[PDB]
Amino acid sequence: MFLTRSEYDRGVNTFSPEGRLFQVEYAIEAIKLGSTAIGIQTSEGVCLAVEKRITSPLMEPSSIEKIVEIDAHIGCAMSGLIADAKTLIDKARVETQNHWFTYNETMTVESVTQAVSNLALQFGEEDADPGAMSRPFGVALLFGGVDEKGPQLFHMDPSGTFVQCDARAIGSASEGAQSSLQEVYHKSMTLKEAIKSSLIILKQVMEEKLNATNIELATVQPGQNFHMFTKEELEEVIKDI
Amino acid sequence: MSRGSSAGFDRHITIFSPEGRLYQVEYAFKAINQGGLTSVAVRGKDCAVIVTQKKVPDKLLDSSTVTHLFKITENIGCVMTGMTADSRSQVQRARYEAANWKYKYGYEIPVDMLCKRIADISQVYTQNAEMRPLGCCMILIGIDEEQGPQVYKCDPAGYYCGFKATAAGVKQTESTSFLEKKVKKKFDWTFEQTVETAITCLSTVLSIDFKPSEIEVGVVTVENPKFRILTEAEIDAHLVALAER
Amino acid sequence: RFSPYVFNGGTILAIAGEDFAIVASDTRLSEGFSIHTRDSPKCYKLTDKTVIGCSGFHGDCLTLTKIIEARLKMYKHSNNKAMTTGAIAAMLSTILYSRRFFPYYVYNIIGGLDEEGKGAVYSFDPVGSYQRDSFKAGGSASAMLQPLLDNQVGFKNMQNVEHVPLSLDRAMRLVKDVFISAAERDVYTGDALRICIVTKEGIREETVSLRKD
Amino acid sequence: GYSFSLTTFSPSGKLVQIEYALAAVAGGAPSVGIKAANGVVLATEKKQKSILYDERSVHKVEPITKHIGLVYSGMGPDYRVLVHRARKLAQQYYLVYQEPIPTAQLVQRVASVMQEYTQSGGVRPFGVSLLICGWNEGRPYLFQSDPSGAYFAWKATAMGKNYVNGKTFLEKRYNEDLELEDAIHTAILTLKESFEGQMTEDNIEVGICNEAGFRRLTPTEVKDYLAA
Amino acid sequence: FRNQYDNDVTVWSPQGRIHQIEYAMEAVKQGSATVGLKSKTHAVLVALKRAQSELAAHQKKILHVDNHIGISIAGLTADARLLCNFMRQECLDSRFVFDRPLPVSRLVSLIGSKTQIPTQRYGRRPYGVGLLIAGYDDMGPHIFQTCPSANYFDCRAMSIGARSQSARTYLERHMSEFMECNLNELVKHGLRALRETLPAEQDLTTKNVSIGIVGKDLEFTIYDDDDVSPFLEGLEER
Amino acid sequence: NPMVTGTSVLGVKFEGGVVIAADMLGSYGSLARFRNISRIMRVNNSTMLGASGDYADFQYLKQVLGQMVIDEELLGDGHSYSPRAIHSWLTRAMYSRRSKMNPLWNTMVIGGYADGESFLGYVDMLGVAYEAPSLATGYGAYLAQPLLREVLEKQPVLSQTEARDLVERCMRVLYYRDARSYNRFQIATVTEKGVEIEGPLSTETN
Amino acid sequence: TTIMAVQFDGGVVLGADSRTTTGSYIANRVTDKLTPIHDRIFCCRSGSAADTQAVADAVTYQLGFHSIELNEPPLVHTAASLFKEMCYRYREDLMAGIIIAGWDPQEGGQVYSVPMGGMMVRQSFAIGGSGSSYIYGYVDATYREGMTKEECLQFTANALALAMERDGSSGGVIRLAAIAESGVERQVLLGDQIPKFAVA
Amino acid sequence: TGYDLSASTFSPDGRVFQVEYAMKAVENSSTAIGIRCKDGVVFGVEKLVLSKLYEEGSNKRLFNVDRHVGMAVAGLLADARSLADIAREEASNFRSNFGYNIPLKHLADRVAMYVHAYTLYSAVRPFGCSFMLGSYSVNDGAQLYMIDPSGVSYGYWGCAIGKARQAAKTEIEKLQMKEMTCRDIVKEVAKIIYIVHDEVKDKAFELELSWVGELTNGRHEIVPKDIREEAEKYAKESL
Amino acid sequence: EPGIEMLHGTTTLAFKFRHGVIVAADSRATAGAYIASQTVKKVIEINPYLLGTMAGGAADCSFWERLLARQCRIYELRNKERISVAAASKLLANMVYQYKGMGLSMGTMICGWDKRGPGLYYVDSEGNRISGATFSVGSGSVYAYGVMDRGYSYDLEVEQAYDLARRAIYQATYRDAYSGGAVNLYHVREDGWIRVSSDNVADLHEKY
C-alpha cells in the first residue's frame, strides 16, 4: 500500500487506525509537561504533594495554589493545564455542595470523581453554543477523601477514566516516580511514613533542589478536615531529609 | 461549523470562476440527461401536450407505477427529466406550492406564477453552501384565463421562460432544431395536425416508429381543462393516424 | 370550573422507638361522601430500613411515591450504596418543595431507623418543612390522634410516674387502641388497619380489622 | 491561492471574489440607461435564442412602483430575486411612511441587502449589477448598483457585453441638454453600436419614467420609435 | 485511492465501506476480554478487570442497569458510562409509566437507534464502546452485543475485546452443553472461557474476575473481589 | 369543562374473568343527542376499557391507546402490556394532563384478565386510581356500587352468570333512577377466550 | 342555524336555512350555509361564522393536497377525521357545526356528524344548530330506512320548514343539496314552495 | 474520483459519487427478494449466519412497519432499523391524522422522499441500504415497492436486492407471478433463495420468510413454521 | 388550607450588645388553630459563622436559607475566606427579590460576627434588607419589641442579656396565642456561634 492523502484530526472525535481517538491521546501526553504530583492512600489517611517548579524568584510562592480541596474532606491535586483545571475544580465544588444540601450528608469521593469524569467527554457540538469545549481537558487530577470508606484516592486522566488507585503518581517524571514508589510502597503505612517516603521520592525526582517553598503537601485523615501544611511544618518535616 | 465546501472552482457551487461561471450548474445541466429520457413540450391554440419515452428495461416492473407525468392540480400538470429522486421531491414541492397558493389567495395558481415560484426555490439552492442543486428540469402545461395554453420550463439554474414549443433531455438540440423548423412554417395546430407533430418529432429524433407502450402523453384542452393522460387505448390510435401520411 | 385538588382522606401515624419505628395507616379511601375501596394501604416500603406513610390527595400520593422510588434507584446507581434515611428525608423535602407553586396536597411521615440503629420519625408539611420527631400523626384524624400520643408516649401532663421507655409490645398495643378509638369519631377512618414494624432484621407487616362503617 | 473564500482578502487586500462577480456582470446582456431633463429611459437586449421562446411570458425590465424601473446585466434568477425582494423593501417604506419611497432610499435598501451577502461567507455574491430609473419631486434620478454593494449615480451608463465601448460611445454623444424622446433614440443608437445581430423589433425591452410614473414600452411602441 | 474517505462518519469509501466505523471497531477490540453465556435458569456476565496497572484497583467492567438488567463494557469507559446513564434513565422511565421492568428486546433497540443517530450527522462520532447485555424477563435470560455500528446481535454466548477470539472458539466448541446447567457450572464455563483469552503466563486471580448473575428470582447481582472466592473455588488449573 | 358524556360504566370481578357494562348514550346535557354510541374499547385480547365522561376525550384515548397497542404488535417480541400496565399508563397520562391544568374530562374503568388473574382498576380525571373487585362511575357509584358490595361481602367469589345477572339488575336500577340513563347498552366479557362485546341489550323488564 | 343532513342508499341529502344572526338582527338572509369541501363532499358550518368558515376553508386546503397525493377520490371518512382533529385541537376556543355529509366510491353515502368539540358518529341522519332542538321529535317520528332521494328531499324540506316556523334565530330560504353518483343538485326552495304546515 | 468528497457535490461528469458508493455498499450485503402474486406478496432473505453463537432468529430483517405492510431490508442493518422506525412513525402519524390505514403507494413515496432528503446536504451522508415495502389490501389487492439509497421509488411485480441481485432477477423472470397464490409461490421463493445462494464462500445461511395477504387478512406475518419447513424441504429437493 | 400557609411568623429576637449578638426564638407551628408541633427549632445553624432565623413561613424560610448555606460555602471555597454578614444578606435579598409577589413569606434575620464585628440584618419576603441594633419578627414581635426596648443596652453584661432574651421571649409567648413551645437561645460569640440552652416556658413561669 502507498501513503496518500488522509484527513487525520480535521473532525474532533476521529478514530485513528486501530481505533484510538486523537485528541484523547494527544492530551494524555500533553500532560507529561505537567508537574509531578504524588498521592498515597493508607489506612491512616492520604497525602497529596506536588512540585510547583518555581520558574523565577520574582514570584512569591504563595500564589501557585497547585493543591486545592474540593470540600473539607476532599482535597485535590492537579498537574498540567491549570486553566480549565480550575473549571473542573469549580464544577467539583458546586456538585459537592449540590449533593450536600439536596442530600444532607457529605458527597462521597467516588461519586465526586465520577461526576467530574461526566463533565469531560463533551467535545464536538461546534454548531451548538451551549455546553461546549470542542477540546478535551488537558489536566490530570488526584482526589483524596474520607468517608465511610475513610481514606481514598482517585486518579483521573484526560479521558474520563478513573480508578480506586492508591500510591499513584502523575507528572513529567511520573513513570520513574511510579516505579520507585512500587518498590517503596508498604501495605500498612503510618501517616508520616507516607509523608516521608513521598517527600524522599519527590526530592529524588524533580530537577531543582527541595526546600519549603519548592513544593507543598496536604493531608486528610479520618480525624478531621482538609489541612494544608504551612511553611514551618515543611521545615519540621524535611529536617530528617 | 459544518463540514464546509471543498476548496475548488468546480468543487462547490458557491465559488465563482474567474469569469464567475457557476460550474455546478453546468454539472447539473449535463446531469439532467441521466436516465436517457428526452421529453418534448408543444402547445397549440387549444391544447398543450407533453410527450416523453417510457423506458421499461425490466418486466418485473409494473408499467402503471413507472411514469413521468405527475398531476399537480386537477387543472395543472407537469413532466420530469433528470434523476428520479429530485423529480419526486419537486413534484411534491409544487403540489404543496400550488395548494398553498390557492389557500392563501382564493383562486387557482396561474401556470407562469407556479413556474416562477419553483424557479425561485431552485435558485435559492445556488446560494447556499451545503445545498445541492436539484438536478432535474420540470415543464408545465395549463390554461390560465385567456392566454389559452402555456408551456413553462424551469431548470436547475433557475432560468425559465414561456415556450410556444420546447423539449428537454438527451436529444435536446436536435429536438429544438426540428421544433424551430416546424414552428416557423406550419403553425395552426388545432388538435391533430397539432402536437402529433411533436410525436413525429420525438420519433424522428429518437428511433423508428414507436409503439405506444414506450410513449406517455398528457394533455390539457382549452374547452376541457383537466390535466389528463392518454393511454395505449388512445395513443395507439393517434400514432396509427400519424404513421399513415 | 375545574378543581385540580381533591381530598381523598386518610390517616397516617408513626412512632419512633429504640429498635423500631412503627408506621401506621388505615385503608379507607374515600371521595366526597362515598367509600371507593376498603383496602388501599397508605404506607409503602421504600428500603429494608425506611418506610414512608402518605395521606391526602391520593393521586399526588401515587405520583410522589413513584418518583421517590425512581430517585431511590437513581441514588443507588450513582453511589453504590443504600440511601440513608436522613438522606431520604432531605430528598423528600427538596422534591416536595420543587412544586412550591403547585403544592402536592399530601401530608407525609417517614418511618425508619437511623444508621446508628435507633428509631427516627420525620414529620412533614405539604410543602416540605420537615423535622425529626419521636412520634407524629398525619391526616384528617391526626387531630384526634395527636393529644393521646402526647399523653402516653410523651408522658405530657402526667405527674409522679416513671418515664419508662416505650417497648415494642406496648407500642403495638397503643397504636391498635388509638386507631380503634379514632374509628368511632372520625368519618374517614376504618375498614382495616395496616401496620409496618421496621426492625434491625428487616420489615414485617401487620394488619387488623377496624370498624367497617 | 487566496481566491476561493470571499471571507479573506487577497495578500494585496483586494477582493478577488467581488472581481469575479464583476466579470460575470460584464458577461451578461447589454443594457443602457439614459437620464434626460424630463425622464429616464432604460434599454436592454432580449436574447431569446430560439423563436420558440416567448418574449413576454417573462420580462427583462421590471417595474417596482408607479415610478421605479429595474434592469440588469448578469444571470437572470439573481435579478428576479432582487426585484422580488426590493419590492418588499419599497412596500415597507410605503407602509411605514404614507408616500412612495424616493429612489435613493430604495438603492440604499438594495445596496445593503446585496452587500450583506458579500460579507457572510457560504453565500456567493449576487453576480449581477442593477440600474435604477426614478422621478422624485418631478426630477429624474439614475442609479447603478454594483454587486459589491456599491451604488453609483450616473448621468448615463451602459453595462453588459462590450460596455466599455458603450460608455465611450455615450461620452461623445450625450449632453445634459437632452430630452426623453431623443434620449430613447440615442440609447437605441448606443445598443446598435454594439448589438452584434441586426436589431429587429423584438430584441429590446424599453422602459421610461416621467412624471406620469415608470411604465414599459409595448413592442408596438418599439417598432413605432424605430420607424424613424 | 484510500485518501480522503478515512476521516468523516458522513463519508463513504468507494468500496461500500465506512472507515470511521471500522476504526471504532478496532477501538472496541482494543478493550479487554469478557464473556456472556447464559442458561435456562440464569444469564451470566464474566469479565476480566484491567490487571495491567499496579497499586490501582482496576476499572469496573460490569455496570448495574436495572433490577433485571446487567451490562458489561469492553471499550472506552467514556461512551460506556454515557450509554449506561441512558440505560438507567429509560429503565426508570418505563418503571415510572408502565410500572413494570423494561423488556430487553426493546431496550436494546433503543440503544441501537441512539447509537445509530450520530453516525449520520456531521461533527459527531460513533459511540466507541463494546457493550454486552445480560437480562432476565418474561421470556427468560437474554444476551446481546452492541458493536459501535449500532448493530446488535442475539447470542447464547459470545466474547468481545482483545484476545476474545480464543473465547469465541471455546464458546463455539462448548455452546451445546450450556442451556441446562446450574449456576456454578455456568460460572465455571464462563471462567474457563475468559481464562483462555488470557496470556498463557497470566492466570486469573480474585482481584481481576467480576462474575455477575441474574435469574428467575435472583435479581442482577454483581460479584466484586474476595466475595467471589467460592465461585473461583473448585476450578482446576489449565 | 365536559360537553357530551356517558353517565356510568359498570365493573365486577369474578372467577376467571371480568364483565362490565355501559349504555348506548351520549348526552349534550339533558338531551340524549346520540343513542347508538358504544363506550367500550377492547384494548387487546386480554385488556378492555370502558369510559365515562366527555366522549371527545374517550375518542382521543381510543386513538392513542390503539396506536400504542398496535405498535406493541408490530414489535412482535412476545412481551405485551398486561392490564396493570395499561392501568398505570392511563393513570400517568391523566395525571400529567392534570398537572398542565388541561384535564381529560373522563373517568375510566380498566378491565383485564391475564396470568389467570382478573384485574379491575379504576381511574378518574384527577389521576386517582386503585383496584377493587367491583367498580362504578357517576351516579353508578352511588347506586350500583352498594348492591355490588352487598353481594360481594356475602359471596366474594362469583361465577359467570351470577355476576352477569347482577350487572344486568343493577344497571336496570340505574335506568330506573338516573337522569342520563338509556335502555340500550353493551356487556363486554374478558377471559381466557379474550374480550367479547355483546349487544345492544335492553332492560325490557316487566 | 338548523343544518341537517340525511343519508340514503347511494347518496345523501343535506339541508339548512339561510339566516346569520347577530343576536336579534339578521346580518345576511341568503347565507349559503352549505360549503362544498370537495367535488362530492359537503358540510354545514354552524355555531358562529368566522371560526367555522375559516376551519372549513382550511380543511378544503388540506385533503386537496392529500387527494392529489393519493391520486384517488377523497374518502368521506377521511374528510370526517381531518375536520375532526382540526376542531379538536382548538376545542377550547372554537365553536363548530360539523355534520359532514358526502358520497364515496366505496361505501355508498355517509353522514358523519359531531357538534363543536370533536367526536365521531356515522348515523343515519344528522341535525345541528338551533332548530334541531325543535325538530328532534318530527325527525325521529318520521325518519324510516331505505327512503329514496325524492322523499328524502320532501322530508328534509318539511323538517326545515317546521324549524323555520318555530325557531326565531333561523329563517330565510331553504338551501338543499343532493349528492349522488352523478353529482350535486343544489336547489333553493323559497316562498310558496317551502312546506306550509299551517297552525290551527 | 477527486471531486467526490461530500454528498452535496456534483462530479465533473455530473454524478453524485457519494451516493453511488452507498449504492455499491448494497452489493456487499446479503440478498433479499420479494414477489407479488395474485393473492399477496411474499418476502425472502439470504440471512447469512455469521457464527453458531447467535441465537436462531437474531438480526431479524423482516421488520413490521405496520399491520398490513412489511419491510425486507438489504444493506447497513443500522440504516435499515432507523428507516423502519421512520416508516413506523409515518404510518402512525397517517393513522392519527386521517383514521384509516396508510396506502402503500403513499407510504412508499413518503419514505422515499425522506431517503432523498438525506442525499443533498453536506451535513449528512446518504443512507447505506435498500429495502422492500410489500403490503396487501383486499380493497386494492397487493403491492410491492423497491427503494434504492438514492430514493428512486418504483413498484415491482417482484424485486431482489443484495450481493446477488442479478441472478435472482433472472430466476424471478421465469415465474408467472401474476397467477399464483401465496401457498404455491412460497415454494418458488425458497427455491430461488437456495438456488442463488453462494454456499462455497458464504456457507451457513438461514432462510427467514414472511408475507401479507388475504390469507392473513392483510396482516404482515412471519411464515407459519410448518409451511416454512416444508418449503425448505422442497428447496433442498430442488437441489 | 390547601397545604400552603406554612406560618405567619412567631416571636423572633436578636440584638448586638458589645459582646456579640444573641438571638432567641420559640417553637410553635400554628396550623391555623391547631398546633403542628411544640419542638420546631427556629434558629438555623447555617454554618459555624452565621445564624439564620425561621419566621413567617416554615418551608420557604428553611429552603431558601439552606440554599443560602450552599451558596455561602461555595463563596468561602472560591474566595478562600469566610463571607461577611453584609454579603450574605445581599445574597439572600437578591435571591428572594425574584419570586416577588408569588406568595413568599420569609422573615429571616442573618446574624454573625464577621470581620466588621457584629452583623445583623433583617431580610424578608418582600425585599426589605436593613441592618440595625434591635430586631424581632413574627406575630409576637410587638410584645418582644416592648420588653426588648425596655431591656436593651449595648453595654449590658452577657448573662443579663440572656435574662433579657428569656424574659422577652416568655412575655411574648405568654400574650400571643400563636407563639409557644420551648425557648431557644443562641449566642454568636467570637468566631463560631455557641448554643446557649433550650429551656421550657412552663419552667420559666416557675422561675418568674
Curated annotation (Swiss-Prot), chain C:
Its main location: cytoplasm. Gene3D superfamilies: Glutamine Phosphoribosylpyrophosphate, subunit 1, domain 1. GO terms for cellular component: cytoplasm; cytosol; extracellular exosome; extracellular region; ficolin-1-rich granule lumen; nucleoplasm; nucleus; proteasome complex. The modification Phosphoserine is found at residues 34, 40, 134. One of its GO terms (biological process) is proteolysis involved in protein catabolic process. It comes from the Eukaryota. Glycans are attached at residues 30, 181. This is Proteasome subunit beta type-1. The modification N6-acetyllysine is found at residue 176.
Swiss-Prot record, chain E:
It is found in: Cytoplasm; Nucleus. One of its GO terms (molecular function) is lipopolysaccharide binding. Pfam families: Proteasome, Proteasome_A_N. GO terms for cellular component: centrosome; cytoplasm; cytosol; extracellular exosome; nucleoplasm; nucleus; proteasome complex; proteasome core complex. The keyword Ribonucleoprotein does not apply. GO terms for biological process: immune system process; negative regulation of inflammatory response to antigenic stimulus; proteasome-mediated ubiquitin-dependent protein catabolic process. Gene3D superfamilies: Glutamine Phosphoribosylpyrophosphate, subunit 1, domain 1. It comes from the Eukaryota. Keywords: Acetylation, Cytoplasm, Glycoprotein, Immunity, Isopeptide bond, Nucleus, Phosphoprotein, Proteasome, Ubl conjugation. The keyword Protein transport does not apply. Its main location: cytoplasm. Glycans are attached at residue 109. There is a cross-link at residues 114, 207 (Glycyl lysine isopeptide (Lys-Gly) (interchain with G-Cter in ubiquitin)). PROSITE patterns: PROTEASOME_ALPHA_1 (PS00388), PROTEASOME_ALPHA_2 (PS51475). The modification Phosphoserine is found at residues 109, 176. Induction: Induced in breast cancer tissue (at protein level). Up-regulated in liver tumor tissues. Belongs to the peptidase T1A family. The 26S proteasome consists of a 20S proteasome core and two 19S regulatory subunits. The 20S proteasome core is a barrel-shaped complex made of 28 subunits that are arranged in four stacked rings. The two outer rings are each formed by seven alpha subunits, and the two inner rings are formed by seven beta subunits. The proteolytic activity is exerted by three beta-subunits PSMB5, PSMB6 and PSMB7. Interacts with NOTCH3. Interacts with ZFAND1. This is Proteasome subunit alpha type-1. It comes from Homo sapiens (Human).
Swiss-Prot record, chain G:
It is an enzyme of class 3 (hydrolase). The lineage of its organism: Eukaryota, Metazoa, Chordata, Craniata, Vertebrata. The chain holds residues 35 to 234 of 239 of the full protein. The modification Phosphothreonine is found at residue 35. The 26S proteasome consists of a 20S proteasome core and two 19S regulatory subunits. The 20S proteasome core is a barrel-shaped complex made of 28 subunits that are arranged in four stacked rings. The two outer rings are each formed by seven alpha subunits, and the two inner rings are formed by seven beta subunits. The proteolytic activity is exerted by three beta-subunits PSMB5, PSMB6 and PSMB7. (Microbial infection) Interacts with HIV-1 protein Tat. GO terms for molecular function: cadherin binding; endopeptidase activity; threonine-type endopeptidase activity. Keywords: Acetylation, Cytoplasm, Host-virus interaction, Hydrolase, Nucleus, Phosphoprotein, Protease, Proteasome, Threonine protease, Zymogen. The active site is at residue 1. GO terms for biological process: proteasome-mediated ubiquitin-dependent protein catabolic process. It catalyses: Cleavage of peptide bonds with very broad specificity. It is found in: Cytoplasm; Nucleus. Belongs to the peptidase T1B family. Its EC number is 3.4.25.1. Induction: Down-regulated by IFNG/IFN-gamma (at protein level). Up-regulated in anaplastic thyroid cancer cell lines. GO terms for cellular component: cytoplasm; cytosol; extracellular exosome; mitochondrion; nucleoplasm; nucleus; proteasome complex; proteasome core complex. This is Proteasome subunit beta type-6. The gene is PSMB6. It comes from Homo sapiens (Human).
UniProtKB/Swiss-Prot annotation, chain I:
It is found in: Cytoplasm; Nucleus. Induction: Down-regulated by IFNG/IFN-gamma (at protein level). Induced in breast cancer tissue. Up-regulated by sulforaphane in breast cancer cells. Keywords: Cytoplasm, Host-virus interaction, Hydrolase, Nucleus, Protease, Proteasome, Threonine protease, Zymogen. One of its GO terms (molecular function) is endopeptidase activity. One of its GO terms (cellular component) is cytosol. The active site is at 10 (nucleophile). Bortezomib binds at residue 58. GO terms for biological process: proteasome assembly; proteasome-mediated ubiquitin-dependent protein catabolic process; proteolysis; response to oxidative stress. It catalyses: Cleavage of peptide bonds with very broad specificity. Changing residue 59 to V: Displays high resistance to the bortezomib, a proteasome inhibitor of the chymotrypsin-like activity. Its EC number is 3.4.25.1. It is an enzyme of class 3 (hydrolase). The keyword Cytoplasm applies. Changing residue 58 to V: Displays high resistance to the bortezomib, a proteasome inhibitor of the chymotrypsin-like activity. Its main location: cytoplasm. Component of the 20S core proteasome complex involved in the proteolytic degradation of most intracellular proteins. This complex plays numerous essential roles within the cell by associating with different regulatory particles. Associated with two 19S regulatory particles, forms the 26S proteasome and thus participates in the ATP-dependent degradation of ubiquitinated proteins. Belongs to the peptidase T1B family. This is Proteasome subunit beta type-5. It comes from Homo sapiens (Human). The chain holds residues 51 to 258 of 263 of the full protein.
